[PDB]
Design a protein around this nucleic acid. Structure first.
Ligand code: CA
Ligand code: CA
Length: 707
DNA sequence: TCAA
């Protein structure tokens, strides 16, 4: 039988491109000891360790690196009768995928889940850990994206008279799509209802009837928002399924503790069978949102794993002092240091060094690590670059570190590794994250960004350049400054000579690779960047990976979206002063919804008493005061500032451990409050209002001159 | 210069 959906990572391999420096051939005469061998070898990839040899892709008892994987290539390696009971689990990341009832027909899913994916549906996967350290995926069914269109405008443009009509019109526009990428679409793929809402822009704007349209897939939604009736303004078509799951279930969070519970008709979460697992988890469940609750009182982070890594590269062309380029076959990765920490206890658990060629670490370095009370390094030796890179990616899949760190890993180390795997070796990456295939594993340039499904990448270079002012942000300099530690260093121009000289000299390169990763680990546990990022994720209502890589706008957008829905609004698609701009927004009740550009909008009100009027950018603007209508931006700011004041009142009486968590929380509220002015001012952003931004600066200027 |  094997897995329901195919695993796309390598579980077997029997031929590969063998690339290796000729200088590793100790018996060869000097003329044959320069350059790189490059050819295809009919062999299983191998790793050597401490005199022993293994195939890289063999899973069994005697492995050279740790594993946290149940399945490998469709074989279950858990003990006989392994069946943990799961009540509470922590979520650190949320995936969003499409499933089809036809694809899942062989999996023994209950009918209530199959209905939610018939003929297709969006599944929300909560990625997490139990208190016992078991890796969990909880697949939540029944979440649908939805958008709005004005009822009268649709009724005149498409001649609709009942909601069923619009479902046909949309199905037609998809059937008629270029290349027929939306073959098989029908009115069953849709639901439409009539609801009363107000456009969030302007004070005079009246409530109106809208079609709220539900859809099964973001692929369909993005086609409709780009192509269906361009003359008709869409509302909230940009909102992802994760955001709907979080906002439509009061209290739910993208990072935190959850509990499984009985649903509405006493329904339960169903454990998946192993051959229906979508991820590299120990246990997986199908559930609906009513099977979930936020677990109160639990606050400790569970035993997530942090990988801290650094690569070392050697240029192989006619100038070994040229900077290495991944696209050149001869410019090799030669070493990868890889430190594995428990993120809850901060303890270093494993020190792995991957090495192209034999490598004997200095006794000096081994003694120092032993004196520091750290794990003895395991050196993994490879005959070729491919075998080493495959082994590293195999470790990433099998150990599955939830958090990954390093220095310049986003701008250099991942881009270099992934370019080798993709361009030189033709390896598919979509199975190497948490998902077993078809997952996101992507690098792109702006400096760079990364998305790996189920892996939170945190580059320490970004953290430190944001936190500390320094002349130089080289790691050696940062270390001297922040950790008061003066390490010894190898330059890129030492590496060619050390590499050619022999095993002991390649050992010196490894010592340096390991001490580099040890310093970065110390930086990480000093600044605790996962705690500030998770505090922002919880406050903003977005996942921690979106928190790192997306901009400031999505944080304010998601909070505004929550409040706007509660108030009946919908969002259309596109001496010193303490907190000057937030406090102007609050004191003057400035908002999208309190603004008027027209005098007749405020003719029923009294000037000064019921509204501000102000000249801004040459135009007369009106803002009604809070007793007429309270600003959404003002409410956000007020509630956040009240929350921050509450948190900071508790810090002096709290435990030394609690004080850290509270400090990260109060800091998260500051960064979000300060981004509100900016959010209004980004032209072509999410929900721009340049009138509000320009009013804030006009008031600010006048306050200084008044003072 | 800075990224190996
Ligand atoms: Ca390096
Ligand atoms: Ca690095």
């Amino acid at each position: 039988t094997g897995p329901t959906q195919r695993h796309t990572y390598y579980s077997e391999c029997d031929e590969f491109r063998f690339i290796a420096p000729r200088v590793l051939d100790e018996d060869a005469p000097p003329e044959k000891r320069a350059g790189v061998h490059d050819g295809h070898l009919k062999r299983a990839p191998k790793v050597y360790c401490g005199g022993d040899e293994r195939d890289v892709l063999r899973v069994g008892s005697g492995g050279f690196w740790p594993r946290r994987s149940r399945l490998w290539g469709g074989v279950d390696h858990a003990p006989a009768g392994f069946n943990p009971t799961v009540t509470v689990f922590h979520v650190y990341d949320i995936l969003e995928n499409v499933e089809h009832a036809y694809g899942m027909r062989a999996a023994q899913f209950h009918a209530r889940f199959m209905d939610a994916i018939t003929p297709t549906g969006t599944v929300i996967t909560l990625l997490g850990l139990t208190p016992e350290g078991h890796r969990v995926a909880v697949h939540v069914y029944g979440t649908r994206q939805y958008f709005y269109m004005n009822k009268e405008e649709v009724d005149r443009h498409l001649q609709c008279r009942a909601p069923r009509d619009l479902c046909e019109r949309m199905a037609a526009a998809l059937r008629e799509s270029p290349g027929a990428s939306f073959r098989g679409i029908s009115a069953d793929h849709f639901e439409a209802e009539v609801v009363e809402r107000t456009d969030v822009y302007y004070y005079e704007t009246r409530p109106a009837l809208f079609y709220r349209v539900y859809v099964r897939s973001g692929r369909v939604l993005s086609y409709l928002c780009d192509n269906f009736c361009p003359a008709i303004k869409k509302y909230e078509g940009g909102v992802d399924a994760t955001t709907r799951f979080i906002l439509d279930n009061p209290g739910f969070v993208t990072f935190g503790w959850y509990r499984l519970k009985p649903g509405r008709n006493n329904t339960l979460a169903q454990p998946r069978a192993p051959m229906a697992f979508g991820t590299s988890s120990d246990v997986e469940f199908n559930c609906t949102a009513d099977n979930l609750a936020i677990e109160g009182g639990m606050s400790d982070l569970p035993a997530y794993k942090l990988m801290c890594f650094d690569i070392e590269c050697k240029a192989g062309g006619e100038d070994e002092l040229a900077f290495p380029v991944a696209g050149h076959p001869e410019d090799l990765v030669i070493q990868i240091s890889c430190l594995l920490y428990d993120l809850s206890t901060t303890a270093l658990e494993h020190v792995l060094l991957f090495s192209l060629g034999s490598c004997d670490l200095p006794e000096s370095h081994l003694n120092e690590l032993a004196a520091r009370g750290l794990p003895t390094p395991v050196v993994l030796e490879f005959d070729s670059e491919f075998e080493m890179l495959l082994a590293f990616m195999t470790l990433v899949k099998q150990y599955g570190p939830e958090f990954v760190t390093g220095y310049n890993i986003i701008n250099f180390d991942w881009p270099f590794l992934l370019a080798k795997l993709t361009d030189i070796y033709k390896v598919p990456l979509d199975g190497y994250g948490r998902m077993n295939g078809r997952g996101v594993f992507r690098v792109w340039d702006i400096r760079s960004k990364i998305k790996v499904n189920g892996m939170v990448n945190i580059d320490m270079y970004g953290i430190i350049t944001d936190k500390i002012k320094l002349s130089s942000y080289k790691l050696n300099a940062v270390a001297e400054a922040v950790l008061k530690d003066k390490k010894k260093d190898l330059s890129y121009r030492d590496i060619p000579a050390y590499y050619a000289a022999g095993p002991a000299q390649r050992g010196v390169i490894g010592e340096y690779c390991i001490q580099d990763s040890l310093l970065v680990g110390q930086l990480f546990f000093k600044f605790l960047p996962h705690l500030e990022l998770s505090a922002v994720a919880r406050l903003a209502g977005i996942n921690i990976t979106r928190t790192i890589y997306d901009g400031q706008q999505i944080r304010v957008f998601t909070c505004l979206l929550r409040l706007a829905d509660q108030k009946g609004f919908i969002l259309p698609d596109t001496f010193d002063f303490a907190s000057l701009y937030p406090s102007i927004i609050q004191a003057h009740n400035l908002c999208f919804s309190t603004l008027s550009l027209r005098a007749d909008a405020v003719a029923h009100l009294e000037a000064g008493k019921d509204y501000l009027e102000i000249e801004v950018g040459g135009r007369r603007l009106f803002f009604v005061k809070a007793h007429v209508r309270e600003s959404l931006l003002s409410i956000l700011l007020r509630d956040w500032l009240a929350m921050r004041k509450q948190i900071r009142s508790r810090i002096p009486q709290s435990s030394p451990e609690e004080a850290v968590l509270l400090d990260k929380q109060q800091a998260a509220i500051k960064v979000v409050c300060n981004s509100v002015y900016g959010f209004t001012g980004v032209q072509h952003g999410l929900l721009p209002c340049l009138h509000v931004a320009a009013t804030v600066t006009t008031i600010g200027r006048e306050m200084l001159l008044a003072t």
